[PDB]
Ligand binder design. Structure first.
Ligand code: 07T
Ligand code: 07T
Ligand code: FBP
Ligand code: FBP
Ligand code: FBP
Lengths: 514, 519, 517
């Protein structure tokens, strides 16, 4: 009668659906990470404190706009807010900083200011920089020098986040003649999309380069790399991060058809993925976005790599204290699909109800996690699981199976790098995975993985290693008792390794909570 | 292989199925999920209604929370005029149903400053007196708000939360009174006229069927509506009341019960048993229960309806942003697709079509998403589970239905063609959720219109006179269906289709499945 | 009844747990029974009783007997079968199968006698000779064999197995036209016993001179199928097909798999054949006996997946040669063959030579009937469907539809009108629980139908009615009358009927769900 446990026992998915129960309350623990974009609505230390209390796990900084000075201050504010809770390490929640790059863009020039484009009219594009400052009703300059190479007669060109739609009729040397499909107001310096085109713009812009160096300087936890189209774009980002940035997680943002097409190579080269639905729905028909989303979430779950669902999840909450019914549904279905994290953009950056937006994602996620059909999900994740000789992988699956057999309150995992805990998360237990680490960055980065509740042990290192291990297990028991995940006498699963250092998790214990 | 998500269709696991979903895999022409559009000022002209039918509208919903009988009579006439403008060629005629959505036990606010269009914008932390003094029913403003629920005090209690306008404005009761409440604006916004008011956690003792509802149901009978969407159904006796009010004259009208509150969810099984179908009325629902639990209730009701073989509609805010914008949000794309994947027979538009700036674009977008989502269903497991979950019965029509759907998967058939007088034989096929469209050929125009409630049914109304020889009459209808599919691009000459008929005239005798190539 | 409680289990494990010895089966037995005819079972009198007890196919073994002897056996089987033809409701078609000798190797005669035996002691010496002067003077010192090439294919260390693999020899000196061996497994050595050489590459023809004569004899006697011995590869099968010629083109070739090479090359052999016999006697000598069940299950599964008949053969009810009841291992084996998915089960010595031939047939009947009810059709049908291509063939669509409908209403039968049998075969391949009553006017189609699990062929002999709808109705009523009389169903039960939209072969597209009148 709690946790949708009745629905969880159903022999079929249809009967599982029929058993879902609005009167079956969820556990306390919410497994899906919440990523909040920070902006004018959410930037103060006092608001950030409430965001953390409301459930923010990751603070996202959008580098499309704003100076390094500004973002540095934002990051400082985030850290001040986070560390205000530091004094009680049992209740302290790590908060990660994510840098989302501007990435390469196609832009128009200066009009004549705005101008009107009428449905059916003719409209030349030129790369002749003499028209850079002189765009108008008959003529439009663009900054992408190689556009004629990458688009054909009959192709479509979108301008100003998709408001405007053109069709290429003539394809010359340094020019294109087009008819205006979707007319409207044409401003200056607008963004241009090219659906279906293989855009050959660099993997990282001049500004992205400076921006990633700033990320390393500022000790960010992860980078959301914009407009990733191929594996080699991920490598160029990785090479720019370099030795100083080598522990920074690269999450690839899939934003166009080519990125969807070449998804498998991108996934293999990345630490995780963001389904950037905003830009993706400009580039592919909006009715196909759910397909791409479900496909990418499935493949990420199969590979055991974090996937973030992004953009317009609770959009109406920019203006309103409650979301639309479509928005509640979108969030629940992203969690049911398998998304590791869900994200807020305008809802937390600019909106009037940023705390309400964060609270709603937390509430829905928690209800949605209880409603997953773990019986089939776990069987399927096993079957598609390769048989290998890696001891930590066998221990992980063993722990998750044990956790289902005894409905443990948690799986406690000692981890330095986070990997042991990620290997458990990939099998999607129902039980929260309390990842105990002394590495503050690991604690921050753990949020990317569904089910991981990171805790940062600050206790001094004991001289006897077995005692230092027992010290950290007990810390995890105290965190669980305090947050109400379980109580004395409940059963939990504990994972440790055979020696200090990373790579040696091979020990699973089923233990009473002291 | 590379159309209709057939690579995904063949996956041995649901996880692998998801992994194979392909944006470059184009759907078939036929869209199975019915689209219900609310008609109002933006869409009630004949001219616009014609374009709604071309864009995909199957049912025209009339919302009796507003408007006079004269107003709704004319909307209905316009719907029929637009629908019959296509009747000259019976092969391309699309039937359109008329649905009456009852007002039911509502609480509504009054007019702002005596105007239905006037608004005040309110601020958080203000004071607002509510009143039942009918002297203020058209003098609602920043300070005084009139409500039509005469028993408001009861029920209500101090500290209770009162919600106005689709839950967007929130008031908290600081003090009770004889016929007045005193409140603080917990959440601000622009307050308008005749807005819906909710009292979650209060026992609203308003009748199941008010005198206005009785007036409206009588009108629906007189106007020959196809279905009634009954508001705020709480228990089986509510459904029986509507059925007895409709009486003999309304005995063929379908009753769709709207589940809009906590008691309706709890008592869902007896409501379903009593009803002809269900609407998941998410607007009120997500105010009466926590918004975060609406998806649970939605998926439970779609599941139980699918298991019962009764139609279920998912309603409210599916493409809400399209009221002001030509393109929906990504959440709205997802919401429509996920309703279809859940198993919803029909999807609905309200303000998007009733009063928005882009009613045609909203109908088109629902058509497009529905069709993409229908190809993405994991039929392999779905059909296995519907088969397993259905009892082993002696009913010959039920055996033929499952046989037909099985055969339709085996040959990836262009259609399942079903002859039906009442619709039932076509409903029995729809229940097993074939990929193929079901072409239901009838001579009963009501059956034609009502069959849109069922996933996958494309009703076609045969106009040809009855032939003296019954076998020739049957064959005439089968060929009409052949002609319709080909004109619509469902299939071409030499494609294989499944054909369902009976062994004698009249309802209840469907027992014959034939697998026939398209001539 | 019919283990229907077990049938509804959501798991194979729970299905087993629900099997119930107090749940009686239906009357219908879907698994064909093939009986080997010999002196125990050859008279018309005894063949009539065999038919009553459930024989569907009479196998003649051409390892022994003259063309004159076998023609007489065939006449007796045909006389036996046609004695029931006075009552069309009760007539059962019985097929005739010819089983070739193939490239066998045989020893000679112990001391000039067909019954004499000698004792071979473990470790004692035995000289094998090809000197035809010892052809009828075999004893414990010298044994003659009829494979003249045995010396150019075995090597010192080689093993040679004699008499159903009960006696084992090891070559300790290889000669010119001789071998010297030491007896590993001793015992009683008799005359004209079978010899095998596992690991040896035997140089004998796929189809010998005598084999050719026998296959031509088959064509002339109008047999229904041929069981072709020791098929090692596809080209062996094409050789049998070639001898059968255009005149015997409708005769079913069942490839008998009896050695390692046959198993290894199974897929090419199955694609060439009309069916398969798991010939377990020779197979369990050519390969280790403990591996035979693997081969049996691989072969039954591959045949079920290809939709081709498969027969399980040899030693199924062995002890019943001397005893009126079987061992527990034999009850288990017949049942498990049926659960594996064998279309037919066979008897050899049990019916040919043994003391209790009617009891062996009756036992196979009783066991098969219980085991068919114990099949987990829920998973079987689901796998067969999934492992089935999406096709444009209307008859296939109709067939899978009819099987689905038969499960939905637990139909008393699926009735199928068929000229060539193909339509009924297409239904059988999806393994319905309901019996498939195949109504044909073609006597060969009715006889060959017995090779497919589930098919109960009935031969309609009434003249073709001018009105086609009435001719179809006539046959459907005939199938209803047969089923009633046999207790497959009663008035008020529901049956599935499959027909075409016109007369002639290849038009099956119509399924109807009808009450039994
Ligand atoms: C949503 N869904 C569906 C739908 C169908 S068809 C009968 O409409 S079967 C099925 C199904 C099975 N399992 N799970 C859990 C699961 C399994 C594999 C991957 C994920 N993400 C989630 C599911 O989530 C799940
Ligand atoms: C023998 N068998 C069968 C047969 C069928 S139907 C197509 O004739 S499905 C199936 C099946 C499935 N699993 N296993 C392994 C198993 C599972 C559960 C209990 C036992 N003893 C053995 C089986 O052993 C097993
Ligand atoms: O998840 P990682 O990075 O592999 O770390 C897991 C490691 O943590 C431990 O449990 C504890 O190690 P430490 O004492 O070095 O922190 C090791 O036995 C184990 O290998
Ligand atoms: O779905 P329903 O209402 O039972 O109608 C199906 C009926 O239609 C038919 O196929 C044709 O009947 P009619 O000629 O009376 O229209 C009957 O054979 C069958 O019983
Ligand atoms: O299995 P086959 O050889 O295709 O025979 C099936 C045929 O039998 C029938 O049901 C009846 O045919 P007949 O009237 O010629 O016997 C046909 O309609 C159908 O095509």
């Amino acid at each position: 009668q709690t946790q949708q446990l009745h629905a969880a026992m159903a022999d079929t998915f249809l009967e599982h659906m029929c058993r879902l129960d609005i009167d079956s309350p969820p556990i306390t623990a919410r497994n899906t990470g919440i990523i909040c974009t920070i902006g004018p609505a959410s930037r103060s230390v006092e608001t950030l404190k409430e965001m953390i209390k409301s459930g923010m796990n990751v603070a996202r900084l959008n580098f499309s706009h704003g100076t390094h000075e500004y973002h540095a201050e934002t990051i400082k504010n985030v850290r001040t807010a986070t560390e205000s809770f530091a004094s009680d390490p049992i209740l302290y929640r790590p908060v990660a900083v994510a840098l989302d790059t501007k990435g390469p863009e196609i832009r128009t020039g200066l009009i004549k200011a705005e101008v009107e484009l009428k449905k059916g009219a003719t409209l030349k594009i030129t790369l002749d920089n003499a028209y850079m400052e002189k765009c108008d009703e008959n003529i439009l300059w663009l900054d992408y020098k190689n556009i004629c190479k990458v688009v054909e007669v009959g192709s479509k060109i979108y301008v100003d986040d998709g408001l405007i739609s053109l069709q290429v009729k003539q394809k010359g040397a340094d020019f294109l003649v087009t008819e205006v499909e979707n007319g409207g107001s044409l401003g200056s310096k607008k963004g241009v999309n090219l659906p279906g085109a293989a855009v050959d713009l660099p993997a990282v812009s001049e500004k992205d380069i400076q921006d990633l160096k700033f990320g390393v300087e500022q000790d960010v936890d992860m980078v959301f790399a914009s407009f990733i189209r191929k594996a080699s774009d991920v490598h160029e980002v990785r090479k720019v991060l370099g030795e100083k940035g080598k522990n920074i997680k690269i999450i690839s943002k899939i934003e166009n058809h080519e990125g969807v097409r070449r998804f498998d190579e991108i996934l293999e080269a990345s630490d995780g993925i963001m389904v950037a639905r905003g830009d993706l729905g400009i580039e592919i028909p909006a009715e196909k976005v759910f397909l791409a989303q479900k496909m990418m979430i499935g493949r990420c779950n199969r590979a055991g790599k974090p996937v973030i669902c992004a953009t317009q999840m609770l959009e109406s909450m920019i203006k309103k204290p409650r979301p639309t019914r479509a928005e509640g549904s979108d969030v629940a279905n992203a969690v049911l699909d398998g998304a590791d994290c869900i994200m807020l953009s305008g809802e937390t950056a600019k909106g009037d109800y940023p705390l309400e937006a964060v609270r709603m994602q937390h509430l829905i996620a928690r209800e949605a996690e209880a409603a997953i059909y773990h019986l089939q999900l776990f069987e399927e994740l096993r079957r598609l699981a390769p048989i290998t000789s890696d001891p930590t992988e066998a221990t992980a699956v063993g722990a998750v199976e044990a956790s289902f057999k005894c409905c443990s309150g948690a799986i406690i995992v000692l981890t330095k790098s986070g990997r042991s805990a990620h290997q458990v998360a990939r099998y999607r237990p129902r039980a929260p995975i309390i990842a105990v680490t002394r590495n503050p960055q690991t604690a921050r980065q753990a949020h990317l993985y569904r089910g991981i509740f990171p805790v940062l042990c600050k206790d001094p290192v004991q001289e006897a290693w077995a005692e230092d291990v027992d010290l950290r297990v007990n810390f995890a028991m105290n965190v669980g008792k305090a947050r109400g995940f379980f109580k004395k006498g409940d059963v939990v699963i504990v994972l440790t390794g055979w020696r200090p250092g990373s790579g040696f998790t091979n020990t699973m214990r089923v233990v009473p909570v002291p």
